Design a protein around this ligand. Structure first.
Ligand SMILES: [Zn+2]
Ligand SMILES: [Zn+2]
Ligand SMILES: [Zn+2]
Ligand SMILES: [Zn+2]
Lengths: 204, 204
């Protein structure tokens, strides 16, 4: 059963790219991306957007999957899910139709597919690919992450984004580390400060 | 060679206790202790004090050793030392007589012994035990930690404090996790905030 989903960057025939729009630099920001650390910081259940770009359009019926995987060797074969206390509680579950066990939801998409793989047990969310507005650059996807990094037990998570044909064939792949808490702006500032401490230590 | 120094709490015949005086709650504090997380937060090369208490005085010639040990299983047999970039640089080394490879120094003590164990390679710092002022409660030891947590590569460190006879026999032992950065007050607040996120999740 315990497969590790493939992760390597794969630009593919359509030069699939995943980027992040410009983010607030405030301690109060609802999400923020650190280019320095290559880390996306978001808040539980709040909009956490990515930007997709392709160089030419993909074929008809293409989709985009998001699949979280734990990064550390001792966790990599464990399926990433909502923590049980969030899963069985009321918060963000009532009035919502997405399965409570899933970590990743998509906001603003009514053709979302929450997948629980029967063979691997991996959980992911798939949406159909939508091209950008005529003459514009990016397709935006609004994710919502439904647990904090503090919920388990931090265990770093990689979010693997794939461009996929209707038959499942991978046409592109990128990934990013996602960090979730009630103070993402503060976490960015602290991680960047700690990083800088050490980056001035090198000799020459 | 690769011994793991013994760590278990051992009050011993003199009920050896290690505590922390009241700390500033400011983001600007030079050191601070979290009773919630059981963590001491200090700054590189700055005073980082502990309080020793015994119920009756120990015997003549007794000493107190501080020995850092990495907490995580994959690091526990690695000797904890100053990172090489700090060790071979000028900062806090020039004008000072403590060996540059040592992580832990003692401030204000002129009988400090910097030990490099010939068999184990473990590095520690020993001072003679001094009783409190007549009719007072605590013996204070001023440590200075000479690398940031960011220096390696955080790798959590346990600081093991032992009360020892002249012959090396252990009369008492306690320990604490130490966290070192240029913003200890901020780290405390962030860790306590993240901790609280998760502590309200339990059911009943
Ligand atoms: Zn959770
Ligand atoms: Zn936070
Ligand atoms: Zn260092
Ligand atoms: Zn800090």
């Amino acid at each position: 059963a315990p497969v590790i989903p493939s992760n390597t960057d794969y630009p593919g025939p359509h030069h699939f790219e995943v980027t992040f729009q410009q983010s607030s630099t405030a301690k109060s920001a609802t999400w923020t991306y650190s280019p320095l650390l290559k880390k996306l910081y978001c808040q539980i259940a709040k909009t956490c957007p990515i930007q997709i770009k392709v160089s030419t359009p993909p074929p008809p019926g293409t989709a985009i999957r998001a699949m979280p995987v734990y990064k550390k060797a001792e966790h990599v074969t464990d399926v990433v899910k909502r923590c049980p206390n969030h899963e069985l509680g009321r918060d963000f579950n009532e009035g919502q139709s997405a399965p409570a066990s899933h970590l990743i939801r998509v906001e603003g998409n009514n053709l979302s597919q929450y997948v629980d793989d029967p063979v691997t047990g991996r959980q992911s969310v798939v949406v159909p690919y939508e091209p950008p507005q005529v003459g514009t650059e990016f397709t935006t996807i609004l994710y919502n992450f439904m647990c904090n990094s503090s919920c388990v037990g931090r265990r770093p998570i990689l979010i693997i984004i794939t461009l996929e044909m209707r038959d499942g064939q991978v046409l592109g792949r990128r990934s990013f580390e996602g960090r979730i808490c009630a103070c993402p702006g503060r976490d960015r500032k602290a991680d960047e400060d700690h990083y800088r401490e050490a980056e001035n230590l090198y000799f020459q």
